[PDB]
Design a protein around this ligand. Structure first.
Ligand code: HEM
Ligand SMILES: *[C@@H]1O[C@H](CO)[C@@H](O[C@@H]2O[C@H](CO)[C@@H](O)[C@H](O)[C@H]2NC(C)=O)[C@H](O)[C@H]1NC(C)=O
Ligand SMILES: *[C@@H]1O[C@H](CO)[C@@H](O)[C@H](O)[C@H]1NC(C)=O
Ligand SMILES: *[C@@H]1O[C@H](CO)[C@@H](O)[C@H](O)[C@H]1NC(C)=O
Ligand SMILES: *[C@@H]1O[C@H](CO)[C@@H](O)[C@H](O)[C@H]1NC(C)=O
Ligand SMILES: C/C=C/c1ccc(O)c(OC)c1
Ligand SMILES: [Ca+2]
Length: 595
């Protein structure tokens, strides 16, 4: 066994039993073991961590040491050989809107974050890793293979630092290293409100007693709000353009400004919250600040649950959706709602769905201006193209009228992310999201592909012919084999994503199984699930049953023409209808008859 509960960083676990609202930290959801699904605790291990030394080291740390008799391939070599492609033609998913990709990143953020090791204060370590590419302690550089273009213009490696782990920040033994999930495992709208009280309050507007979320005072969007700027220096949003000097936004989740479209979706959320607190004020004028905030927060987290589970998940899982997420049967206190470590990798499937460009569209959904279509890499940490360039309404149109990239066996990840990714405190648009993912798998001591195949009640190929038959691809199988030398060594991220898509779905069997379980666990282990009897009133539930993303757009943007089904591909003007004919969220069921 292990020390039953290592817990030096998490002390305070005091719970109010009457409380009708979720805590910001996730704590007190589970009564028998409150810390389940709470921010700042270890990610769950569905299977024992697999580490080079069986403690904290990652495979590929010691050159001599092999995994199952073979050396594991360099993350970047796998990337170049398998992940990359040149031709962006015929790569768009015909039946998925770009919103599909976007919602997947939103939901993912709400659920898990495993941030890097924070051990360098007035230290050159972030630069000693980057400048001289020397692996040590938390620094775990992604080295370039022999034939690599980036070797010629960038250096010997790409900087990479290991993720944070519970108890000691830098040293520990002998139990296996466990990474931290810095957000709440629950689909609770954390990304809008925060997972810490320190952040939660800063995000709030406590000046007025209207329970509104703090907005921007330096800029507006045709009378509509923008999230507040985060005034911390240095900002990468200012670094990308030093002339525009527009900093990153401040949201409930740290990563909000990574790409313009996510920041965009973050802006749509804050608005719907403020819009909700204003309607509650009008029907319940006796309700105070905190109460207006909490009830609005309660409704938004319910909205994210319905969209994700009713509209989003069935089109990710497709045929495999009932097999894993059968109709709700109520809260089950024995269900672990913690995000597992492997899900933070299973969910990365979304990377394949990211297209190489983003567009801006006018009322007739036509190119908005001369540069309307821009390359994705010019949008990493770019908040200025929203403030100084037309607001969100044009971007929210792109999201409805354009397509997500379709995952493709010979075209998995676009170069915008493969070669051109920007990372804070590193200057260049010259990083690789694919290499990073694979590096992270090893950093998190991930079990190989077959361990996971076995875990899901699926076959475990040991030959080239076996792998060919599972992937339904000769050449993909051969490249993987030549690199890994065995399936048993294939990193889960590239292994799960290499499998053909399930019928009516956008992922393979292995991912549909992993994604499948996790989502059902976060629905069943949630005491505050919107459908759990007693959370909302019988009537409130009938009002919430009508929410839509279309409605979220109409309610919080000046667009008046939207599809009925926001995630499927939709063309203008045919697939578009007026906002007038769209179900509204009636808030009458929230009337507080106190007298
Ligand atoms: C830029 C990036 C994106 C869009 C242009 C993007 C998009 C997605 C989608 C669509 C996802 C799911 C449907 C998704 C999931 C997860 N991501 Fe990814 N993402 C961009 C960039 C990054 C970067 C950089 C990281 C950090 C990777 C690391 O190991 O350091 C990243 C991570 C993740 C992630 C793991 C979250 C966690 O638990 O830490 C997903 C589950 N994304 N992204
Ligand atoms: C930096 O941001 C500035 C300011 O928004 C961008 O400047 C503008 O872009 C074009 C000119 O090419 C004009 O439409 C705007 O009027 C410009 N504004 C100003 C103040 O010059 C500039 O293009 C951005 N630069 C980079 C490298 O991203
Ligand atoms: C598109 O997806 C929807 C589900 O989101 C489905 O009902 C429809 O049949 C699909 N269209 C095609 C051509 O497969
Ligand atoms: C707080 O709310 C008041 C009243 O609506 C508003 O005037 C003020 O601008 C808000 N402050 C912030 C920082 O959002
Ligand atoms: C509750 O979870 C337990 C443990 O996973 C499971 O055995 C049981 O079937 C669940 N209860 C219901 C009503 O589904
Ligand atoms: C801010 C930095 C950042 C932004 C978006 C991400 O997805 C991420 O990786 C977990 C880090
Ligand atoms: Ca959460």
């Amino acid at each position: 066994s292990w020390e039953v509960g290592c817990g030096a960083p998490v002390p305070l676990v005091k719970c109010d039993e009457n409380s009708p609202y979720r805590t910001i930290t996730g704590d007190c959801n589970n009564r028998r073991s409150p810390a389940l699904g709470a921010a700042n605790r270890a990610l769950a291990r569905w299977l024992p961590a697999e580490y080079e030394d069986g403690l904290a080291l990652p495979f590929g740390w010691t050159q001599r040491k092999t995994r199952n008799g073979f050396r594991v391939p360099l993350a970047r070599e796998v990337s170049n050989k398998i992940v990359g492609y040149l031709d962006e033609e015929g790569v768009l998913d015909q039946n998925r809107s770009l919103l599909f990709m976007q919602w997947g990143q939103i939901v993912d953020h709400d659920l898990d974050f495993a941030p890097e090791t924070e051990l360098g204060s007035n230290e050159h370590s972030k630069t000693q890793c980057e400048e001289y590419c020397i692996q040590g302690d938390n620094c775990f550089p992604i080295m370039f293979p022999k034939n690599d273009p980036k070797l010629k213009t960038q250096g010997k490696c790409m900087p990479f630092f290991r993720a944070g782990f519970v108890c000691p920040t830098p040293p520990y033994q002998s139990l296996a290293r466990e990474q931290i999930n810095a957000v709440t495992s629950f689909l609770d709208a954390s990304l809008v409100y925060g997972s810490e009280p320190s952040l939660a309050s800063r995000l709030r507007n406590l000046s007025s007693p209207l329970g509104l979320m703090a907005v921007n005072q330096e800029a507006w969007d045709h009378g509509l709000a923008y999230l507040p700027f985060n005034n911390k220096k240095p900002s990468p949003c200012e670094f990308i353009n030093t002339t525009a000097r527009v900093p990153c936004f401040l949201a409930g989740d740290f990563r909000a400004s990574e790409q313009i479209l996510l920041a965009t979706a973050h802006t749509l959320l804050l608005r719907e919250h403020n819009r909700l607190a204003r309607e509650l004020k009008k029907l319940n004028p006796h309700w105070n600040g905190e109460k207006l905030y909490q009830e609005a927060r309660k409704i938004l987290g319910a909205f994210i649950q319905i969209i994700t589970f009713r509209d989003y998940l069935p089109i990710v899982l497709g045929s495999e959706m009932q097999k894993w997420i059968p109709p709700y049967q109520g809260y089950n206190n024995s269900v672990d709602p913690r995000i597992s470590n492997v899900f933070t990798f299973a969910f990365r499937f979304g990377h394949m769905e990211v297209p190489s460009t983003v567009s801006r569209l006018d009322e007739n959904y036509q190119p908005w201006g001369p540069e309307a279509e821009l390359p994705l890499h010019t949008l990493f940490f770019n908040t200025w193209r929203i403030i100084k360039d037309g607001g969100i309404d044009p971007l929210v149109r792109g999201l409805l009228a354009k397509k997500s990239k379709l995952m493709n066996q010979d075209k998995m990840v676009t170069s915008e992310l493969r070669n051109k990714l920007f990372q804070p405190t590193h200057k260049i648009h010259g990083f690789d999201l694919a290499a990073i993912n694979l590096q992270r798998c090893r950093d998190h001591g991930m079990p190989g592909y077959n361990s996971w195949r076995g875990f899901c009640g699926l076959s475990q190929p040991k030959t080239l012919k076996g792998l060919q038959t599972v992937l339904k691809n000769k050449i993909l199988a051969k490249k993987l084999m030549d690199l890994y030398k065995t399936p048993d060594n294939i990193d889960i991220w590239i292994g799960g994503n290499a499998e053909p898509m399930v019928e009516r779905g956008r992922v393979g069997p292995l991912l549909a199984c992993l994604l499948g379980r996790q989502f059902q666990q976060i629905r069943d282990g949630d005491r505050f699930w919107w459908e759990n009897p007693g959370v909302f009133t019988e009537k409130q539930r009938d009002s919430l049953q009508k929410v839509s993303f279309s409605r979220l757009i109409c309610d919080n943007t000046h667009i008046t023409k939207v599809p009925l089904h926001a995630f499927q591909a939709n063309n203008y003007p045919h697939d578009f209808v007026d906002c007038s004919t769209v179900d509204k969220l009636d808030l009458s069921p929230w009337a507080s008859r106190e007298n």
